[PDB]
């Protein structure tokens, strides 16, 4: 679960790549509790794991 929404007020949201930049920090709906990942086309936060 890593796409912009809020089922509590709006049910859908979106952002651009030019608001992630070099930082890609996690966000929330600016009047609620629902937490969302700031990402463009991929719909996912990452892992940086090893195998
Ligand atoms: Zn909301």
Describe, in short, the structure shown.
By secondary structure, the chain is mostly loops.
Would you kindly provide a written description of the structure presented here, covering whatever features stand out?
- This is Adventurous gliding motility protein X.
- It comes from Myxococcus xanthus.
- Residues 3-37 form the Zinc finger/thioredoxin putative domain.
- This protein starts with 26 loop residues before the first strand and ends in a 15-residue tail after the last strand.
- With 51 residues, the protein is mostly loops.
- The chain has one domain.
- Helices cover 0% and strands 8% of the residues.
- Strand 1 (27-28) and strand 2 form a beta hairpin.
- A two-stranded antiparallel sheet has the order 1-2.
- The chain is globular, with a radius of gyration of 12 Å.
- The protein is built from no helices and two strands.
Structural class: little secondary structure
**In order across it, which strands form the biggest sheet?**
1-2
Taking the sheet with the most strands, its summary is: 2 strands, antiparallel
What is the number of beta strands? 2
Instruction: Estimate the strand proportion.
Output: 5-15%
Topology as a string of helices (H) and strands (E)? EE
Shape: globular
- The figure for the number of domains is 1
How many angstroms does the end-to-end distance come to?
24 Å
Rounded to an integer in angstroms, the radius of gyration calculated over CA atoms is 12 Å
Share of helical residues: under 10%
What ligands can be seen in this structure?
Answer: zinc ion
Number of helical stretches of at least 4 residues = 0
Domain Zinc finger/thioredoxin putative: 3-37
Protein name: Adventurous gliding motility protein X
Organism: Myxococcus xanthus
């Amino acid at each position: 679960m890593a796409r912009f929404v809020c089922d509590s007020c709006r049910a859908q949201y979106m952002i651009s790549d030019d608001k992630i930049g070099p930082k890609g920090v996690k966000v929330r709906c600016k009047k609620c509790g629902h937490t969302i990942t700031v990402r463009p086309a991929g719909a996912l936060e990452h892992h940086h794991h090893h195998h």
